[PDB]
User: What shape does this take?
Amino acid sequence: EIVQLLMEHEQTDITSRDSRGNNILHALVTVAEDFKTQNDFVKRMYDMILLRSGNWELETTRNNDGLTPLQLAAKMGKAEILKYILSREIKEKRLRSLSRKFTDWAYGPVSSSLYDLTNVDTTTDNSVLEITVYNTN
Amino acid sequence: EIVQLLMEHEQTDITSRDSRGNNILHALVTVAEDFKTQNDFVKRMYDMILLRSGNWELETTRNNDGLTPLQLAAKMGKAEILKYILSREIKEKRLRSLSRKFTDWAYGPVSSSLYDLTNVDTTTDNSVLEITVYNTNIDNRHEMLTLEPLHTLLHMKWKKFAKHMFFLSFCFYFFYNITLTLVSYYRGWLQLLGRMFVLIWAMCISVKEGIAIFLLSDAWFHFVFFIQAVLVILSVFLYLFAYKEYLACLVLAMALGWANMLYYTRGFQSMGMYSVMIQKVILHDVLKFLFVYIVFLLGFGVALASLIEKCPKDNKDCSSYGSFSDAVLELFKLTIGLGDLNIQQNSKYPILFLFLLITYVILTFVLLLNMLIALMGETVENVSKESERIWRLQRARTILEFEKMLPEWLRSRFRMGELCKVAEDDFRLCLRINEVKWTEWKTHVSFLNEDPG
Amino acid sequence: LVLAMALGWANMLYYTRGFQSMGMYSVMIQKVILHDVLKFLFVYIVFLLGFGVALASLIEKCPKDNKDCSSYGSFSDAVLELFKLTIGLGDLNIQQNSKYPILFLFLLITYVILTFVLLLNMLIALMGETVENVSKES
Assistant: This one.
């Protein structure tokens, strides 16, 4: 409730970056732990905030360590938030451009979905796939 | 209902002590059993009565055995009532002074609670921590030392002193045993330098382990170290005196010492659980094997000696089996693969002989030796769960021993815990434990400091 | 040269990770060496070093210029002879030049018992315990 109050407030700045460089999504990633602990309310808040401000601005930024909240979830050990972020299906046709997974065609039970490799597929400098493999911590 | 009737009655005396010395709380402790049995209605009644009469009068008294209901729950095996008593959070601000656990500060999920060490932390005569460790009449002590203040008392003591005293002891014993080996192996000034220290530290081990063995399967090491020291100093006496038997006791003491390196594997988690599992395998499995095996050695020994009993005709190589000793020794060779299996002259019954030997090989190898491996495979599965707790218990007893060996001032130097003000007049030594809980959210009302630190 | 060769054939193992059936196998080996075998080798070497100086001091009497009379020379020959005995090569007999043949024999039999019927089978049980947990994550 308080989150919706603050975002609905016209003066709130959703994209604000704290002293560490983290915006709100980085913060939600550095927190979230596991299902046996938090019962997964962080994924819900992450979705809520993204859908509430339509943009790639939040998820494309970088904290002072030079990481997007996706790459940050890769550096840290957070699987439950990474599955969510890494496959998103947004059903509402307005905000559907924010999804990372799409259904190319579906007929009966058979369906061919489609995934987005931008920061994943290791055509970039440090991607999600290089981190999850070479990260020994 | 009837309890509330009696307490609400003005004439009832809540603090009455029966002929055994027990007040009502002692009585509730001597009763309560477990959750699978009573479904835990005793904890509820204990809470009800305390909250109904505000005081420390009840829980501070002593029955005729000189025990508070807390210490009594420690003597007896009662864990479920001890967790309750040992951490109490009373939310009502009036009676909050009776709690043994407090929240120093809480912000969001993070909260730092605070525990009360008064009769726990072993600054008293017989405390909750000394009892749950040294009390051998229970065998519930696994779940006893996993409770909230006790776990971190042991941990903090280890991180403060008991680690360094344990390692230091390992060094002083290790040098001792090396010098003992170098003395044993070479038999000018080396004997004068080392041998004196051998006698000295051996005498120290003998006296200390002897005093500890006068206060009596947990203490089994105290017998072994003592036996070693006796053998060492005895060998010294027989070396000063003129005798040939000194070397036997010397080398036996040495080998026994290297068998006593094992005691120091309880300082490490990975090796500690290992030596625990060995200690249980020897008890539950191997002994049964050695008994039923020795009965066969003794059977087939007299079985074969009587057949090979014919006269060697002054040829020791013709008859391979002499009296009962040579037969048993030859069978034990055969288990290793040294023994000589052939049709034997001087044995008038070579077929029966050979059959009766083959039955030995079969009963030993393909049956009774593999049975042991299967059984060990059965015990490892059950012990793998409790081994960590068992090792925590042993480590705990070592910790308390090192604590009891310190001087009064150096002991008071550490003094785990801190003074904290719980109430207006209440200052009590407390132990801080930080916690993070995401499961249940609430507005924090009862707490100690407003500013989280 | 030969040490490098043998090490190379020990390095064939690295290429078993291209196949599923052998890859999981070499993983389970890699974990067994770490969790189980090392604990065995430590507690076993401490016994070799114990009984070596135990027996050498008893057989320490002069061979009388006969190398076959005294089977145990310095600490090396004793350890080597024990390791023979584990394989079944070692020569077990009442030994001349050992002034204490009963104590000697007892102290050797205790070695055989502590090794085989106890500490070597313990390893097999523990490995049987680790294979059950590793079989899932391998």
